[PDB]
Amino acid sequence: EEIIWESLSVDVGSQGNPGIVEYKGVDTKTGEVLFEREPIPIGTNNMGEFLAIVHGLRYLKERNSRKPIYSDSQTAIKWVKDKKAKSTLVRNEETALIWKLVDEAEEWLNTHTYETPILKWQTDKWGAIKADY
RNA sequence: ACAU
DNA sequence: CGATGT
Ligand SMILES: [K+]
Ligand SMILES: [K+]
Ligand SMILES: [Mg+2]
Ligand SMILES: [Mg+2]
């Protein structure tokens, strides 16, 4: 109902889908960019959204921060909850890099704990997520 | 349909 | 318009 301003917001940007994928995380309150992932040559929107959330979890854990994460991605939120990114993207040589990162993100989820709430950014009510590209 |  | 997803 109300924005939790003491939070980290993430978003994916892409050139094509599948296409070049990047993501970033921002302080929801201030818009300060807290992390940005170097563009990945081929990936899907949902893989990027998933990697962004997981990176946020790792970022906040490293800093002993209990802030929640906002994502606007129904899909990625579910994939993180499940610890399983159910992407349809073909695994081939061109998609190897994104799939390695997705596999490693799943692996991290499966070997670490966190209490970070992962919250749906309610775009219909609040406008674009603050990490938007 | 909903979320991108 | 087409693509990624539940
Ligand atoms: K975006
Ligand atoms: K669809
Ligand atoms: Mg998004
Ligand atoms: Mg966006």
Please indicate if the annotation marks A11 as binding a ligand. yes
Q: Give resolution, Å, one decimal.
A: 1.3
Q: Which of A123, A106, A125 is nearest to A55 (CA)?
A: A106
Dihedrals phi, psi of A80, to nearest 5 degrees = -65, -45
Three-state DSSP string of chain A: CCCCCCCEEEEEEEEECCEEEEEEEEECCCCCEEEEEEEEEEECHHHHHHHHHHHHHHHHHHCCCCCCEEECCHHHHHHHHHCCCCCCCCCCCCCHHHHHHHHHHHHHHCCCCCCCCEEECCHHHHCCCCCCC
The region, left, alpha or beta by phi > 0 then psi within -120 to 50, assigned to residue A16 is left
Token pair, residue A51, equals 């990697």
Beta bridge partners of A37: A23
Determine whether domain A1-133 maps to CATH 3.10.300.10.
no
Dihedrals phi, psi of A130, to nearest 5 degrees = -70, -15
- The distance (Å) linking the CA of A65 with the C1' of C6 is 30
Which residues 107-126 in chain A have a CB closer than 7 A to strand C? none
Write the CA distances from A63 to A66, A98, A109, A128, integer angstroms.
9, 26, 17, 26
Token pair, residue A126, equals 């609040």
A79 touches strand C (CB under 7 A): yes
Q: Could you tell me the distance, in angstroms and rounded to a whole number, from the CA of residue A131 to the centre of ligand 3?
A: 8
- The distance (Å) linking the CA of A40 with the C1' of B3 is 23
Angle, CA of A42, A13 and A34, to the nearest 5°: 115
Domain ranges of chain A: 1-133
Q: Amino acid identity of A104? A: E
